[PDB]
Amino acid sequence: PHRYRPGTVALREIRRYQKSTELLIRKLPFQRLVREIAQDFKTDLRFQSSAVMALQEACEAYLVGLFEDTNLCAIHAKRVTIMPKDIQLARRIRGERA
Amino acid sequence: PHRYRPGTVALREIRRYQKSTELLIRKLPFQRLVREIAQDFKTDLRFQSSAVMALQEACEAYLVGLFEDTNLCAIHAKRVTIMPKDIQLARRIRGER
Amino acid sequence: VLRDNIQGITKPAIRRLARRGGVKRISGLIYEETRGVLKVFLENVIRDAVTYTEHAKRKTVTAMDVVYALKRQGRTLYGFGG
Amino acid sequence: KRHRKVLRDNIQGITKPAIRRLARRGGVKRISGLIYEETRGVLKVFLENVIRDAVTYTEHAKRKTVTAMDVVYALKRQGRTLYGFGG
Amino acid sequence: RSRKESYSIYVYKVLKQVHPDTGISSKAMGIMNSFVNDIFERIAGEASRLAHYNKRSTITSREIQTAVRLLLPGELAKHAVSEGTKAVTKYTSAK
Amino acid sequence: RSRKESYSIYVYKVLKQVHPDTGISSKAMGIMNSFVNDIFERIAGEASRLAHYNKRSTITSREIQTAVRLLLPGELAKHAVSEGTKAVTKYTSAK
Amino acid sequence: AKTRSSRAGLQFPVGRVHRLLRKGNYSERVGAGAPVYLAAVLEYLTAEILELAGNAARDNKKTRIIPRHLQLAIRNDEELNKLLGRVTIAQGGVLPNIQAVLLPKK
Amino acid sequence: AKTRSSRAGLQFPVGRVHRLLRKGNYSERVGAGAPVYLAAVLEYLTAEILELAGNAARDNKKTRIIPRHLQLAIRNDEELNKLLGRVTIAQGGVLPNIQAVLLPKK
DNA sequence: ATCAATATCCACCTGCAGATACTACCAAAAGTGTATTTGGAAACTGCTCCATCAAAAGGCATGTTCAGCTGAATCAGCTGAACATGCCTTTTGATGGAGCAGTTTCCAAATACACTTTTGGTAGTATCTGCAGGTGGATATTGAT
DNA sequence: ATCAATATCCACCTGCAGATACTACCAAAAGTGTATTTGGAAACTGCTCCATCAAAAGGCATGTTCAGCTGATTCAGCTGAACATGCCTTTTGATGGAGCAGTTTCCAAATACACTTTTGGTAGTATCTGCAGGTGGATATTGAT
Ligand SMILES: [Mg+2]
């Protein structure tokens, strides 16, 4: 019964997803979220297909970048595990918050 | 003979300089530095005195802010002593590097 | 079996993003925290896009509306016009 | 003209106490000894960047005198808008 | 000697309306002047970009308003918009 | 129906001058378009500002040059000012 | 002769705002109500900053608003703080704020 | 009838650029040189980028440049990375980069 | 806790810089009033392309197991804070000289503007092919023993 | 170490989603001929800006001492990685119709232009007042005991 050690798949997945450029959130759920959020600003709205793909590209690109920074924050604190506080510190310093 | 313990004057200084607004670098040195650097870009420049003051207001505000971020990075690593790597991490996440 | 739209952003998806991010190991509270962050991002962008839409007296949000909303939020995006 | 004293190593006029005072206004309680040189490096870069841009405005106006406005415009370009000196 | 204008006067009137017993230093006034010139440019800029995006050659109060909404945060926006609209309605009906 | 203007074309010529045996995807060309528009807006706007700062009413090649210097990094700014200067000379030296 | 300001019931100068909209190359044409709206918007923001700055002057037992009072007002108000998040107010200093872990004892 | 582009030695369109300058409200008037200069700067940068993109498709055994190639070419060039530091390249992914401390020891 | 050192606080008090106050001149706005031009809202509708949905697709929720990471605790070493001492360098405030921003007045050169050719560049249409996946088998990496 | 489990790389194949190629208008560049506009080239000011000298404090440099912080070390417990799959949500592809986008129309609203009137800026003098910086002196704060 074979079994990879904790970390070994993770690294494998890093090497994999850094190599590729496909989106990583599933479309329909991202799309429904967009509409939920937009409903709160104006009702009965329609979205060009490419207007939703633009959003998805932007978010994914944002979050991946935030995760790079977040990861540097965990590493600064001598950890290798990213916690919320790391995400909060990165946003704080980016000027997105606080 | 009397001694405040390590940190106790540090906290006093923070409260003091957070309460005031005067420039914290001496004027004449700052001005020489501004003239050195510009001279290396273009010789025979003159400066309106308010140009130099603007530069100084702007540098001090930039460093004070960077020291705040630097401090947050030290505290995040469970320290209270800011180190170069703290300045470095703040600058990277700011996009300065 | 009902569910919050935001929870449509699944733990495995979030993890993938982090892996593109170079992250090796993830606390379990990140997923909720990430969802929060992502929501505020879309709120801010969408609010500004929709604002462009209403200015144009349209009922469709266009790629350009988004692009312009991105631009001014300092998240300039290449590849969708503009 | 006749002479004009050479400027060298003026970055050192950004002394340790001055730096410590900036850090206190930034809330910092304890400071590693290496911070002083690191801060001088960071400061020099920020000044070079702003001055480079201001002087470019000066040269473009064909003046020999850097103004507050020249500085103010450089600051804004660089996302450090400054109030209090015009513009 | 050339006329260098500023918003010093307007600022001082508004100050007297909100704090009739309160003065302002010329440094502080310089700051206020910077503030108004800054917000002026930011709004005017957004409106310009806006008109252009919509192939209009004209910046009307409608473009100012959308700019305001793009630029200001929540409650500042809401209030700015009402004072704006109020000033226009009144102006329009006062010739 | 109506015309949608782009640079997708000048880009293709430059591609052929630079890598004659290499093609480009639709998306890729979309990016290159955004790129050209972006840099165009950055340089124009900065040029616009210079001209206004100096109370001039005209955007000459000198305003473009200065802009390029303010906007581009070291070497990039520099191979670029030469190219731009070269084009002006050649366009001038051309009956 | 009524100023367009009094017509609109503003302290801020509508004519001047109109002129600046022209000379700033923002568009071919400027609608008659743009400067009215804009001058009103600026007037409102300045009223708003002055209110909080005044308060900050009175809190420090002062009659005269200095740059520190603008800075205290702006930075203690969420929305002004955001609107002016990338701006430096000369002679403003910073808000008194020490991180808890730095305080003595436990 | 000779295109100003061919006079200038350029592929990019001096005329179009002249026009975009007139109608983007940048200034009351526009020099004759200004659009030539600008067009040439745009062509130059386009070139430099296509050049490096080119090489990156070549390196990946491909003849058709895709957004990815543009990302590898920009983020591996110090100066283009700086110029485009606040820009997202759709469908670009990110550079292979793992922090050394995360690599397995043994 | 109690005691002594010293930092802190606050409140009153005179010199004075920076603020407010006129005064008055005026030059540049801003406003007023026709004469003239047009941008863009309004209304009508053609035709993309967007919402909706049925069948086909394949990613994710789940619960268990324990590897190894995180956070707590202890501690030796040495770094950085506090502080006294000696004195250099900045600050402050004069004085002169001039290098240079800031104007004004006249044109030659440059750029806008109205009008007509003459294409270069686009949409719509027609061929052409790079490579995204598929398979097969060799090879590399990981982990157990 | 060797050995099996499993991931990864590499060579080759091939249909078609997506390039490139071609055609044929035509909006918008280019060419032409006047109609403004502008950015200096000279020719002067009055500044700010630079230099420099002298006095004086106010802060800087330095060395010593040791409090307490940092980083090393050790370790137990908790918490996230790895794991197999059918249930179910997402993906795909086919079809009405919403509304974006094309087009035309026309007047409320814009620019333009030449007067008329006003206000906001400055500069000359004049007065004033808030508060910076100094003074004890009554109230904490800290740290040694
Ligand atoms: Mg030098």
mmCIF file with all atom_site columns, C-alpha atoms and ligand atoms in Angstrom, chain B residues 35-37 39-40, chain D residues 6-8, ligand 1:
data_model
loop_
_atom_site.group_PDB
_atom_site.id
_atom_site.type_symbol
_atom_site.label_atom_id
_atom_site.label_alt_id
_atom_site.label_comp_id
_atom_site.label_asym_id
_atom_site.label_entity_id
_atom_site.label_seq_id
_atom_site.pdbx_PDB_ins_code
_atom_site.Cartn_x
_atom_site.Cartn_y
_atom_site.Cartn_z
_atom_site.occupancy
_atom_site.B_iso_or_equiv
_atom_site.pdbx_formal_charge
_atom_site.auth_seq_id
_atom_site.auth_comp_id
_atom_site.auth_asym_id
_atom_site.auth_atom_id
_atom_site.pdbx_PDB_model_num
ATOM   1 C  CA . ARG B 1 35 ? 23.029 68.715 -3.510 1.00 0.00 ? 35 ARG B CA 1
ATOM   2 C  CA . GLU B 1 36 ? 25.493 65.872 -3.779 1.00 0.00 ? 36 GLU B CA 1
ATOM   3 C  CA . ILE B 1 37 ? 22.970 63.571 -5.381 1.00 0.00 ? 37 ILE B CA 1
ATOM   4 C  CA . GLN B 1 39 ? 25.096 67.309 -8.724 1.00 0.00 ? 39 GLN B CA 1
ATOM   5 C  CA . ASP B 1 40 ? 25.818 63.772 -9.780 1.00 0.00 ? 40 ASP B CA 1
ATOM   6 C  CA . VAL D 2 6  ? 33.639 69.034 -3.213 1.00 0.00 ? 6  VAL D CA 1
ATOM   7 C  CA . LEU D 2 7  ? 30.656 67.105 -1.851 1.00 0.00 ? 7  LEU D CA 1
ATOM   8 C  CA . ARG D 2 8  ? 31.418 63.568 -0.690 1.00 0.00 ? 8  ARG D CA 1
HETATM 9 MG MG . MG  K 3 .  ? 29.716 64.076 -6.624 1.00 0.00 ? 1  MG  K MG 1
#
